Each structure stands twice: as C-alpha cells, then as structure tokens.
Amino acid sequence: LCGRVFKVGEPTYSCRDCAVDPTCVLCMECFLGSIHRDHRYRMTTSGGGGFCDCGDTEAWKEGPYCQKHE
Ligand SMILES: [Zn+2]
Ligand SMILES: [Zn+2]
Ligand SMILES: [Zn+2]
C-alpha cells in the first residue's frame, strides 16, 4: 500500500539479507520502519522511476511490510 514512485536523486534501500533479488527496494519511510534497518542494507540513489516494494511478499524473504503499512 506504499507504492511510492522514486524521484530523481532519491535514496532507495535494499536488504542484502532479505531481498529476493537486487531490484527489490524500500523507500526511506518504509526502510526506517522495517526490520531491515538492523540488517546488511544497500542504499542506491534513484535516477528517477522505479517504486517501493513494501508489502510485496514475493520481494522479501522476511519482513515484507514496514510498521506503517502492515
Ligand atoms: Zn515505501
Ligand atoms: Zn511501508
Ligand atoms: Zn532484511
């Protein structure tokens, strides 16, 4: 229920422990309210476009939702 579309220069966060593949990402809001802030995460700046995968159970091996969207 996030669905945020990233803007130019916006940080995106993946979790190296939980992402199903390297394109699985969270926006800043969802990352900071998720279990993955305590994991090995990777921040990549968006060039614009793409979207947050919070809530997609097929994107995450654990912790698919943040506290705001669960
Ligand atoms: Zn989000
Ligand atoms: Zn969320
Ligand atoms: Zn994780």
Curated annotation (Swiss-Prot):
Q: Which positions bind Zn(2+) 2? A: 15, 18, 36, 39
In what tissue types does this protein appear?
Broadly expressed, with highest levels in skeletal muscle, kidney and pancreas. Present in acinar cells of the pancreas (at protein level).
Where would one find the signal peptide in this protein?
A: none
* Subcellular location as annotated: Nucleus; Chromosome
Q: Indicate which residues the UniProt annotation says bind Zn(2+) 1.
A: 2, 27, 30, 52
Q: Which residues bind Zn(2+) 3?
A: 30, 54, 66, 69
Q: Where are the zinc fingers (UBR-type)?
A: 1-70
Q: Where does a peptide bind?
A: 51, 53, 56
**In which family does this protein belong, per the annotation?**
Belongs to the E3 ubiquitin-protein ligase UBR1-like family.
Domain characteristics, as noted in the entry: The RING-H2 zinc finger is an atypical RING finger with a His ligand in place of the fourth Cys of the classical motif. The UBR-type zinc finger forms a pocket that mediates recognition of type 1 N-degrons. It exhibits preference for arginine in the first position, and a lower preference for lysine and histidine. It binds N-degrons with a methylated arginine or lysine in the first position.
The record's function comment reads: E3 ubiquitin-protein ligase which is a component of the N-end rule pathway. Recognizes and binds to proteins bearing specific N-terminal residues (N-degrons) that are destabilizing according to the N-end rule, leading to their ubiquitination and subsequent degradation. Recognizes both type-1 and type-2 N-degrons, containing positively charged amino acids (Arg, Lys and His) and bulky and hydrophobic amino acids, respectively. Does not ubiquitinate proteins that are acetylated at the N-terminus. In contrast, it strongly binds methylated N-degrons.
Protein name (Swiss-Prot/TrEMBL):
E3 ubiquitin-protein ligase UBR2
